[PDB]
């Protein structure tokens, strides 16, 4: 189906943009680059795993990995007077007493490729800027979910969608060529503006075309196109290690889509009072609005939360991610079936409870049981996927046609606000205690579970 394919491609191409940070911006293990260590290593013959025993701050209670990652012994490594057995025994009565400094001269990264982290040195004190990368995108989303309606009111639909697709394709391509963090964040923001606009527009068009009976099914099929997008993201990120190659390979298809769309007649897609206060005027409607806002926020937070957490902590990222993407499909069938069989409130509650429990269990798990961790992670991802499917319908059902679209605009803006807050909770906060983010996700999931039961 051409008329179906041309929109599902525009859904599948959105997933590499939203989640791509997990592959464009991994943080590999690193230590302070150390001038003269290469010379002393050449003299003494230290192998890669051996040099880190003698040339980096040692681990201890409470890890001390921060010292290894962000400090270095200020030793005169050029000295041939140093012992090749262990130079630090020649220099101090105890290693603890050596002079220590910051990595003034550079960084060494254990990867054959590169990521934005490795390429702009977003390590140690700079590491917040990495969360600033995903935050700028979700800020683009927030400005999109509100400004796109006004724009499309003031600018013609065909012109609007042509513009936003061209700008998405270009800005995504140009991001690969950004030479500095400022320009990269600006392209990330422009793409944040236009990507959600395109995604919502394509969704609207596909649901406007398909008959009202099949429309509901086609919505879930359009979601599953996102999962196929995640699978493609994994494949490309495995074939193309350097983040620029990946960014081009991700962006190009949306460019070629315009070279296709212009070459053949596709005009029907574009050719074919509400007030914010009225969403709150009455206490029951107001309460339901608050609940839907909360649940959209919670599921956004948990979805990006689990994906970024996995990106930050998984030991076999590519298969830990592949086996997680391919779980949304069974999740989609479980959703569609259960929606038809017994409704939507009980599934949305149970699936949020399942997500909360899965997050909580990941606190207690012994992490060497990688096979258990990946299973619980999959159970969580399935849960939050089913909940997102359910709430996409429930947010239509609980608002009347007089305000339904404004309710969607609100809820989506709440999702984008959660997308803005989630990164700093996942990374910039995780350095306090690795349980913390999972405690938050557990609490959020359990509350979303309990709160859900109040909806009619
Ligand atoms: C993570 N976000 C906000 C998405 N674009 N995807 C989704 N289906 N919610």
UniProtKB/Swiss-Prot annotation:
Glycan attachment residues as annotated in the record: 53
Keyword Ribonucleoprotein applies: no
Catalytic activity as recorded in UniProt: 1-methylnicotinamide(out) = 1-methylnicotinamide(in); dopamine(out) = dopamine(in); serotonin(out) = serotonin(in); (R)-adrenaline(out) = (R)-adrenaline(in)
Regulation: Phosphorylation of the transporter leads to changes in its substrate affinity, resulting in a regulation of the transport activity. In contrast with rat ortholog, ASP uptake is inhibited by protein kinase A (PKA) and C (PKC) activation. ASP uptake is also endogenously activated by calmodulin, the calmodulin-dependent kinase II and LCK tyrosine kinase. Inhibited by cGMP, most likely through a cGMP-binding protein that interacts with OCT1.
Short sequence motif Proline-rich sequence: positions: 265-269
SUPFAM superfamilies: MFS general substrate transporter
Topological domain spans for side Cytoplasmic: 153-158, 212-217, 340-344, 395-406
Effect of mutating residue 10 to I: No change in fenoterol uptake. No change in trospium uptake. No change in terbutaline uptake
UniProt keyword terms in alphabetical order: Cell membrane, Glycoprotein, Ion transport, Membrane, Phosphoprotein, Transmembrane, Transmembrane helix, Transport
TM ranges: 4-24, 132-152, 159-179, 189-211, 218-238, 245-265, 290-310, 319-339, 345-365, 374-394, 407-427, 435-455
GO molecular function: (R)-carnitine transmembrane transporter activity; acetylcholine transmembrane transporter activity; dopamine:sodium symporter activity; identical protein binding; monoamine transmembrane transporter activity; neurotransmitter transmembrane transporter activity; norepinephrine:sodium symporter activity; organic anion transmembrane transporter activity
GO biological process, one term: quaternary ammonium group transport
Record annotation: effect of changing residue 284 to H: No changes in MPP(+) uptake
Outcome (variant: residue 13 to S): No change in fenoterol uptake. No change in trospium uptake. No change in terbutaline uptake
Modification note: Phosphorylated.
Tissue distribution: Widely expressed with high level in liver. In liver, expressed around the central vein. Expressed in kidney. Expressed in small intestine enterocytes. Localized to peritubular myoid cells, Leydig cells and moderately to the basal membrane of Sertoli cells in testes. Expressed in tracheal and bronchial ciliated epithelium in the respiratory tract. Also expressed in skeletal muscle, stomach, spleen, heart, placentacolon, brain, granulycytes and lympohocytes.
Summary of pH dependence: Optimum pH is 8.5 for the transport of MPP. While optimum pH is 6.0 for the transport of the drug quinidine, no transport activity is observed at pH 7.5, possibly due to the protonation of quininide at pH6.0.
Phosphoserine modifications at: 275
Reported effect, residue 407 to A: No changes in MPP(+) uptake
All ranges on the Extracellular side of the membrane: 25-131, 180-188, 239-244, 311-318, 366-373, 428-434
Effect of residue 430 to M: No changes in MPP(+) uptake
Location in or out of the cell: Basolateral cell membrane; Apical cell membrane; Lateral cell membrane; Basal cell membrane
Record comment regarding domains: A large substrate binding region with partially overlapping binding domains for structurally different substrates is formed by several transmembrane helix domains (TMH) including TMH 2, 4, 10 and 11, and it is alternatingly exposed to the extracellular or intracellular side during substrate transport. Amino acids in TMH 1 confer major functional differences between human and mouse orthologs.
Family: Belongs to the major facilitator (TC 2.A.1) superfamily. Organic cation transporter (TC 2.A.1.19) family.
Note: Involved in the uptake of clinically used drugs including diabetes treatment medicine metformin, neurotoxins 1-methyl-4-phenylpyridinium (MPP(+)) and iobenguane and platinum-based drug cisplatin. Also involved in metformin efflux transport. Metformin competitively inhibits OCT1-mediated thiamine uptake, leading to a decrease in hepatic steatosis. Plays a role in the anticancer activity of cisplatin and may contribute to antitumor specificity.
Listed name of the protein: Solute carrier family 22 member 1
Organism expressing this protein natively: Homo sapiens (Human)
Lineage: Eukaryota, Metazoa, Chordata, Craniata, Vertebrata
Gene: SLC22A1
């Amino acid at each position: 189906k051409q008329a179906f394919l041309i929109l599902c491609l525009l859904s599948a191409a959105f997933a590499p943009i939203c989640v791509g940070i997990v592959f464009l911006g991994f943080t590999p293990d690193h230590h302070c680059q150390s001038p003269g260590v290469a010379e002393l290593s050449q003299r003494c013959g230290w192998s890669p795993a051996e040099e880190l025993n003698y040339t980096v701050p040692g681990l201890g209670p409470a890890g001390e990995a921060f010292l290894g990652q962000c400090r270095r012994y200020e030793v005169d490594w050029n000295q041939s007077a140093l012992s090749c057995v262990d130079p630090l025994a020649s220099l101090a009565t105890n290693r603890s007493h050596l002079p220590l400094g910051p990595c003034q001269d550079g960084w060494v990264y254990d990867t054959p490729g590169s990521s934005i982290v490795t390429e702009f040195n977003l390590v140690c004190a700079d590491s917040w800027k990495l969360d600033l990368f995903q935050s700028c995108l979700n800020a683009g989303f927030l400005f999109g979910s509100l400004g796109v309606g006004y724009f499309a009111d003031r600018f013609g639909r065909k012109l609007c969608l042509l513009g936003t697709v061209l700008v998405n394709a270009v800005s995504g391509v140009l991001m690969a060529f950004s030479p500095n963090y400022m320009s990269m964040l600006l392209f990330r923001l422009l793409q944040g503006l236009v990507s959600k606009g395109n995604w919502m527009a394509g969704y609207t068009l596909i649901t406007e075309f398909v008959g009202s009976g099949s429309r509901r099914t086609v919505a879930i099929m359009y979601q599953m196109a996102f999962t196929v997008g995640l699978v493609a993201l994994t494949g490309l990120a495995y074939a193309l290690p350097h983040w620029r190659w990946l960014q081009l390979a991700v962006s190009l298809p949306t460019f070629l889509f315009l070279l296709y769309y212009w070459c053949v007649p596709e005009s029907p897609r574009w050719l074919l009072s509400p007030s914010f206060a009225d969403l709150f005027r009455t206490p029951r409607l107001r309460k339901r609005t608050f609940i839907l806002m909360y649940l959209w926020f919670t599921d956004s937070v948990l979805y990006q939360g689990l994906i970024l957490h996995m990106g930050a902590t998984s030991g076999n990222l590519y298969l830990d991610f592949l086996y997680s993407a391919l779980v949304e499909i069974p999740g989609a069938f479980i959703a569609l079936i259960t929606i038809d069989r017994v409704g939507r409130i009980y599934p949305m509650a149970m699936s949020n409870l399942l997500a909360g429990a899965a997050c909580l269990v990941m606190i207690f798990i012994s992490p060497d049981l990688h096979w258990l961790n990946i299973i619980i992670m999959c159970v969580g991802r399935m849960g939050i996927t089913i909940a997102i499917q359910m709430i996409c319908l429930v947010n239509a059902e609980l608002y009347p046609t007089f305000v339904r679209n404004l309710g969607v605009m609100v809820c989506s803006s709440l999702c984008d606000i959660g997308g803005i807050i989630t990164p700093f909770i996942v990374f910039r906060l995780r350095e306090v205690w690795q349980a913390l983010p999972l405690i938050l996700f557990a609490v959020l999931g359990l509350l979303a579970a309990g709160v859900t039961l109040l909806l009619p």
